[PDB]
């Protein structure tokens, strides 16, 4: 039904809206499994005026194939390929049987009272640079295309319409919208408020022949495919496509397609600092002023009527370096507050590119804000609390979420002045009360100065939901907020013991097998592995078993087992795990089989082995210092995990060995040209009793 009469209107909440960005990097090959936004949300507890957070579905640029949510089709593209370390390769989603990180983040954001915006790079599973190869998913792009032009459903689709085919990789783009993108949208439903599609003109216009400038639906079919795929899941989801920055001499936003509910609103300037050089400061600040002048509407300035509700929105960076990370702010505290307030107070919306400390999941990630970003956001919060909507009380964020109804169980939730609601002028909240249809069992009382409590006990027979208004009062009047109550729904696979005891899924519990000298990874998750029928907060403890297994909490509903076993841990390992609610608890037995490192031959008598009789090493160069590290698990192995010693037994004098650490020995020395050619050495590997020797062979190239 294009042109769509809901276009833009469905992003009305975006007007005055303040957003943040949470973007981990290098998400592929299981990396994203078990990752949680909870620490971030803890850190920003005191930020009451923020409205939403942007999350990846895909990563940008050459990482556009890597997804953070599981999909059957994408998982198939894996084909189980592995690395020289056994680690996955060509896996560009989380394994469906392991984790859905996105659903985690989506629900945590909901519970935290926040809406969501989802980032998708338009190039998706295709390769942005086809004459490049990605050494982590080397042929996923190939396989996606492969899957596309040979599939019962996925040709009946490619051929289902005439406009599906055309220039470049157009047909594959429609694949993604229908089979990948639509499945996600349908799954998540109203947990997703907005989608922003990056690199849209790069691929949809320049490659696949769409015209974003046009108002002919036939020119914007890919734009349609993507929007419709999103609207199938949430008809109120606001859509934005990155069709480049606008004009410094005019509208700073590239004109709306028929499928834009809001402006993507990329800043002027390339990579790096969006306010240096200085001209960019003017261009970008004028963009924010544009949002103010136009009361948050992007396109009330042209000759088309249909785009008149499209919301003005900006996607700036807070750091000097990137959207999602960066050590240094590009704006002063004062400038940050001014830009934000100029842009959104009776204006449009802003997704700040808020920097986390360390986003690379392969390098000890710290997925919380840079202290300065919190600083700036807090100063902003103080301002918006006082000045965004003066007079009557303000409620926090976008929603007020109440705990679930548990039939027969006591109900209790606090609403706190300064947290959930406040008087802008700071005199105080003089009352809280309700109107509408409330549980007969519910009392609303003031339990301390500034704290109201919703409490009571639903009967066992309570099975109804509730929708009513809470009303906060100050000297100036009342402001309403719609709140919901919903009856809990227990997961299947669990038997209520009737006494409040938290329970494990089964006993024993066999987890995926570990490998010696390899970091272990397994998850324990509320509602899957353990559960509590009163929804009490739970603690898990390892109570017995070998030392190597490490337990850490990722969130209130997610724990992680890690650690590196040794060859000594080989075979069936057994562990006790307690789950407690603080009052009652229960145990289970966890079983993990530790396998030996592959590629070595057990001799059966306790002797260490070596990877080979001849370890052919890296060339040396005459007069250049030589270095090479021998590694337990790569070069040499002991099936009992005994401490090993390597001593030299023969060969040229220039090369010696010294223990680096428990697991590695360094061969070093400086060869000269007189040492040119194949230098043969012998080394002995002894443990306590049994010893085996190997040959090390280094070719020394003379410096001519
Ligand atoms: Ca707000
Ligand atoms: Ca217009
Ligand atoms: Ca007031
Ligand atoms: Ca309990
Ligand atoms: Ca041994
Ligand atoms: Na799961």
Closest to 703 in 3D by CA, of 669, 668, 679, 674: 674
371, 387, 403 — which closes off a domain? 387
* 8 Å CB contact between 552 and 559: yes
The CATH number of whichever domain residue 430 belongs to comes to: 2.60.40.4140
89 lies in some domain: yes
Is 687 labelled as part of a ligand binding site? yes
Is 302 labelled as part of a ligand binding site? yes
3 lies in some domain: no
**Residues 81, 226: one domain?**
yes
Is 307 labelled as part of a ligand binding site? yes
Is 51 labelled as part of a ligand binding site? yes
Give how many domains the chain has, as a whole number.
4
* N residues, the chain: 704
**Residues 210, 191: one domain?**
yes
Of the listed ligands, the closest to the CA of 303 is 2
Of the listed ligands, the closest to the CA of 425 is 3
**Residues 379, 407: one domain?**
no
- Residue 217 preceded by cis peptide, ω within 30: no
Closest to 322 in 3D by CA, of 367, 355, 351: 355
Task: Tell me how far apart the alpha carbons of residues 528 and 514 are, in angstroms, rounded to a whole number.
Answer: 21
Asked how this structure was determined, the answer is X-ray
**Residues 683, 584: one domain?**
no
Closest to 100 in 3D by CA, of 137, 136, 57, 141: 57
Of the listed ligands, the closest to the CA of 478 is 3
Of the listed ligands, the closest to the CA of 69 is 6
**Residues 169, 276: one domain?**
yes
Can you tell me which residue has the tokens 């406040």?
Answer: 422
DSSP string across 202-267: IIIITTT---TT---GGG-HHHHHHHHHHHTT-TT-EEEE---B--TTS-SBPPP-TT-SB---PP
Write phi, then psi, for 103 (nearest 5 degrees). -60, -35
The tokens of 379 are what?
A: 């100063």
Of the listed ligands, the closest to the CA of 566 is 5
Task: Tell me how far apart the alpha carbons of residues 428 and 424 are, in angstroms, rounded to a whole number.
Answer: 8
Is 243 labelled as part of a ligand binding site? no
CA of 485 to the centre of ligand 1 (A): 23
Of the listed ligands, the closest to the CA of 384 is 1
* Burial class of residue 452 (count of CB atoms within 10 Å of its CB; 0-12, 13-18, 19+): buried
Q: How far is CA 541 from CA 492, 506, 531, 547, 585, in A?
A: 24, 16, 15, 13, 11
CA of 17 to the centre of ligand 1 (A): 5
CA of 599 to the centre of ligand 5 (A): 17
267 lies in some domain: yes
Of the listed ligands, the closest to the CA of 603 is 5
* Beta strands at 509-510 and 571-580: parallel, antiparallel or unpaired: unpaired
Element holding 185 (H helix, E strand):
helix 182-188
165 lies in some domain: yes
Resolution in A: 2.2
Task: Tell me how far apart the alpha carbons of residues 129 and 254 are, in angstroms, rounded to a whole number.
Answer: 25
Closest to 632 in 3D by CA, of 623, 624, 640: 640
**Residues 473, 553: one domain?**
no
565, 595, 625 — which closes off a domain? 595
Is 83 labelled as part of a ligand binding site? no
* 8 Å CB contact between 366 and 32: no
CA of 301 to the centre of ligand 2 (A): 6
Task: Tell me how far apart the alpha carbons of residues 195 and 15 are, in angstroms, rounded to a whole number.
Answer: 16
**Residues 14, 109: one domain?**
yes
**Residues 567, 685: one domain?**
no
**Residues 336, 382: one domain?**
yes
CA of 83 to the centre of ligand 5 (A): 28
Residues 6 or more apart whose Cβ sits within 8 Å of residue 150: none
* 8 Å CB contact between 264 and 241: yes
366, 387, 408 — which closes off a domain? 387
**Residues 73, 166: one domain?**
yes
The CATH number of whichever domain residue 675 belongs to comes to: 2.60.40.10
Is 391 labelled as part of a ligand binding site? yes
**DSSP character at residue 201:** I
Q: How far is CA 110 from CA 105, 164, 334, 397, 602, in A?
A: 9, 36, 31, 11, 54
1 lies in some domain: no
609 lies in some domain: no
**DSSP character at residue 344:** H
Task: Tell me how far apart the alpha carbons of residues 218 and 156 are, in angstroms, rounded to a whole number.
Answer: 21
Task: Tell me how far apart the alpha carbons of residues 354 and 377 are, in angstroms, rounded to a whole number.
Answer: 9
User: 131-134 contacts: CB < 8 A, separation 24 or more?
Assistant: 132/62, 134/62, 134/65
**Residues 531, 663: one domain?**
no
CA of 108 to the centre of ligand 4 (A): 22
SS3 content of the chain, % helix, strand, coil (to 5): 20, 30, 50
Task: Tell me how far apart the alpha carbons of residues 551 and 540 are, in angstroms, rounded to a whole number.
Answer: 8
The tokens of 608 are what?
A: 């260490």
CA of 508 to the centre of ligand 3 (A): 59
- Determine the 3-state secondary structure of 594 from DSSP: strand
Can you tell me which residue has the tokens 């999103």?
Answer: 230
Q: How far is CA 105 from CA 34, 36, 65, 557, in A?
A: 11, 6, 20, 12
**Residues 161, 68: one domain?**
yes
Q: Each residue of 43-73: b (16+ CB within 10 Å) or e?
A: bbeebbbbbbbbbbbbbbebbbbbbbbbbeb
21 lies in some domain: yes
184 lies in some domain: yes
Task: Tell me how far apart the alpha carbons of residues 374 and 357 are, in angstroms, rounded to a whole number.
Answer: 11
Q: Each residue of 402-426: b (16+ CB within 10 Å) or e?
A: beebbeebebeeebebeebbbbbee
Is 500 labelled as part of a ligand binding site? yes
Parent domain of 516: 503-595
CA of 431 to the centre of ligand 5 (A): 75
Closest to 438 in 3D by CA, of 479, 469, 409, 416: 469
CA of 532 to the centre of ligand 4 (A): 5
The CATH number of whichever domain residue 193 belongs to comes to: 3.20.20
What does the radius of gyration of the chain's CA atoms come to, in whole angstroms? 30
Q: How far is CA 557 from CA 105, 112, 134, 220, 539, in A?
A: 12, 15, 34, 43, 10
Task: Tell me how far apart the alpha carbons of residues 559 and 524 are, in angstroms, rounded to a whole number.
Answer: 5
């Amino acid at each position: 039904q294009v042109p769509d009469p809901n276009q833009g209107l469905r992003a009305e909440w975006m007007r005055g809206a303040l957003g943040m960005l949470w973007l981990p990097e290098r998400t592929f090959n299981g990396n994203i499994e078990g990752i949680r936004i909870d620490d971030f949300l803890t850190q920003i507890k005191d930020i009451r005026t923020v409205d939403y957070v942007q999350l990846p579905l895909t990563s940008p640029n050459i990482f556009s194939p890597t997804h953070v949510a599981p999909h059957p089709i994408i998982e198939s593209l894996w084909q189980g390929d592995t690395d020289a370390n056994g680690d996955p390769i060509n896996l560009v989603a989380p394994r469906e049987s392991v984790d859905d990180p996105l659903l985690s983040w989506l629900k945590a954001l909901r519970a935290a009272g926040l809406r969501t915006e989802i980032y998708v790079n338009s190039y998706n599973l295709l390769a942005r640079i086809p004459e490049d190869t990605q050494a982590d998913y080397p042929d996923v792009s190939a396989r996606w295309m492969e899957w596309c032009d040979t599939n019962t459903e996925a040709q009946a689709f490619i051929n289902s319409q005439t406009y599906h085919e055309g220039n470049g990789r157009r047909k594959y783009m429609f694949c993604y919208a229908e089979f990948i993108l639509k499945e996600y949208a349908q799954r998540y439903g109203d947990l997703i408020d907005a989608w922003c599609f990056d690199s849209a003109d790069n691929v949809m216009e320049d490659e696949c022949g769409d015209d974003p400038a046009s108002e002919d639906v036939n020119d914007q079919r890919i734009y349609q495919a993507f929007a419709d795929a999103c609207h199938a899941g949430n008809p109120n989801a606001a859509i934005a496509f990155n069709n480049s920055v606008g004009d410094r001499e005019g509208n700073p936003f590239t004109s709306a397609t028929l499928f834009d509910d809001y402006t993507f609103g990329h800043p002027f300037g390339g990579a790096g600092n969006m306010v240096v050089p200085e001209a960019l400061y003017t261009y970008n600040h004028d963009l924010v002023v544009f949002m103010q002048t136009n009361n948050g509407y992007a396109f009330r300035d042209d000759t088309r009527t249909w785009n008149d509700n499209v919301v003005a929105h900006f996607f700036p960076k807070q750091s000097t370096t990137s959207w999602n990370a960066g050590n240094t702010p590009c704006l002063t505290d004062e400038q940050f507050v001014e830009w934000t307030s100029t842009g959104i107070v009776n204006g449009g919306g802003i997704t700040w590119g808020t920097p986390l400390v360390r986003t690379n999941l392969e390098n000890a990630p710290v997925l919380t804000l840079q202290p300065y970003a919190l600083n700036q956001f807090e100063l902003t919060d103080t301002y918006l609390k006082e000045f965004q909507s003066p007079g009557k009380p303000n409620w926090s964020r976008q929603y007020t979420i109440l705990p679930a109804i548990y039939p027969g169980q006591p109900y209790s939730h606090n609403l706190v002045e300064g947290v959930d609601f406040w008087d802008p002028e700071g005199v105080g909240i003089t009352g809280l009360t309700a109107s509408g249809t409330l549980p007969a069992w519910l009392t609303i009382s003031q339990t301390a100065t500034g704290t109201w409590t919703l409490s009571g006990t639903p009967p066992v027979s309570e099975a109804s939901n509730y929708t009513f208004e809470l009303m906060a009062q100050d000297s100036d009047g009342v402001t309403n907020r719609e709140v919901k109550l919903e009856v809990i729904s227990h997961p299947a696979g669990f038997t209520n013991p009737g006494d409040g005891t938290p329970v494990w899924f089964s006993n024993p519990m066999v987890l995926a097998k570990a490998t010696a000298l390899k970091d272990y990874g397994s998850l324990l998750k509320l509602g899957v592995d353990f559960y509590d029928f009163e929804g009490d907060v739970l603690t898990i403890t390892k109570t017995s078993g070998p030392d190597w297994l490490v337990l850490t909490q990722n969130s209130d509903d997610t724990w992680r087992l890690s650690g590196m076993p040794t060859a000594a841990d080989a075979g069936e390992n057994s562990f006790t795990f307690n789950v407690s609610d603080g009052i009652l608890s229960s145990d289970t037995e966890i079983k993990i089989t530790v396998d030996h490192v592959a590629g070595f031959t057990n001799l059966g008598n306790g002797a260490p082995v070596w990877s080979s009789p001849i370890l052919n090493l890296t060339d040396g160069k005459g007069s250049f210092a030589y270095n090479y590290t021998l590694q337990l698990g790569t070069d040499y192995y002991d099936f009992e995990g005994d401490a090993l010693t390597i001593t030299k037994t023969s060969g040229p004098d220039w090369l010696t060995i010294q223990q680096t650490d428990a697991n590695s020995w360094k061969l070093s020395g400086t060869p000269i040209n007189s040492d040119a050619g194949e230098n043969s050495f012998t080394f002995n590997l002894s443990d306590d009793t049994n010893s085996t020797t190997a040959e090390i062979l280094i070719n020394v190239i003379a410096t001519i």
